[PDB]
Structure 1
């Protein structure tokens, strides 16, 4: 049997905020996959965002890119931030899955500008972010931003807020684009 190959190799990371592991060991590399079926095999055997502990993150990044703004592939980049204050457990999991499908399916013209995505699970407010390589590349940031709104089940209430990683680096957070 032959599986459906992906354009890129993707790595799943899990952050727990568990005191048992040292700060430098808290970001755990789970596994990598490069086929569609291997993605579903992973998806079907890992808990969805709505079932994971508070303070945890799931991050899906292209191979050899770590989920940290300070990584050389992310330093000059930024992120499209979706804040989910009043969201159901079903919509949260569906939004994370829709983001994952955009990524692995290479739904953007500026495919090479995608780095990964991160979902932060907090009781007070959940966030899904789509990280990009160059914060100053307006054409890519906007084409990605636009594709995200038209592929995701995102209404007028929840806004897409693009933030530079040089900005997150300091002290709310400064946004350079709103969609």
Structure 2
């Protein structure tokens, strides 16, 4: 018997293409709502260390899209983990840890989390946790510090929260 998840989660893959628009580079892969279905998917997809440069993996719930235009993200923000002095498997493990924190609902303010994104770039790789409300400092801070715990980030790895919106 399967073990149910608190939320339905949807995997998105972005493939960088100069032709298509930012939104059109995003591809919806599949949705799941049980622990077992997650492992089925995770075991049969390439890890982040192996995907093309400029590509993203993203995991979001409540059918929320990894896009600015989405209403759930518009007033939102994100904890950004810039990975320096990280191995390919450090990347894969940190990403996996983020996934398990999300589907596991490890955060007290789990309602505030929209999803997580990993960016594969040559200059620098990044893993981000997207929050629903940027102005909810207490929720962000709790998510932030727990994230630093669950991921056991070194001093070299940076953790910074930022608003999605561009504002003065």
Rounded to whole Å, the distance in 2 between the matches of 1:124 and 1:101 is 27
Contact 1:61 1:117 in 2 (8 A): yes
Rounded to whole Å, the distance in 2 between the matches of 1:158 and 1:167 is 25
For 1:57-79, what per-residue CA distance to the aligned partner results, in whole angstroms no more than 9, with x for missing partners? 00000032000123100000100
- Change in 2 beyond 3 A, CA 1:108/1:24: closer
Q: Secondary structure at the match of 2:64?
A: coil
| Comparing 20-29 and 115-124, the one that deviates more | 20-29
In structure 1, the gaps of 5 or more residues are 170-179
- Change in 2 beyond 3 A, CA 1:91/1:23: closer
Contact 1:85 1:124 in 2 (8 A): no
Structure 1 runs (4+) deviating above 4 angstroms are 19-24
Match of 1:65 in 2: 64
Rounded to whole Å, the distance in 2 between the matches of 1:164 and 1:30 is 27
TM-score using structure 2 length: 0.95
Q: Secondary structure at the match of 1:140?
A: helix
For 1:83-103, what per-residue CA distance to the aligned partner results, in whole angstroms no more than 9, with x for missing partners? 013210010000000000000
Contact 1:32 1:63 in 2 (8 A): no
TM-score using structure 1 length: 0.89
Count of residue pairs brought into register by the alignment: 168
| Bigger relative CO (Cα 8 Å, ≥ 6 apart) | 2
Q: Secondary structure at the match of 1:79?
A: strand
Structure 1 residue 23: Cα displacement: 5.1
Q: CA RMSD in A?
A: 1.7
Rounded to whole Å, the distance in 1 between the matches of 2:74 and 2:21 is 24
Matches within 5 A, 1:20-169: 24-167=23-166
Structure 1 residue 21: Cα displacement: 5.4
| Comparing 77-86 and 12-21, the one that deviates more | 12-21
- Change in 2 beyond 3 A, CA 1:26/1:53: same
| Comparing 101-110 and 24-33, the one that deviates more | 24-33
In structure 2, the gaps of 5 or more residues are none
Structure 1 residue 20: Cα displacement: 7.0
Contact 1:79 1:131 in 2 (8 A): yes
Q: Secondary structure at the match of 2:29?
A: strand
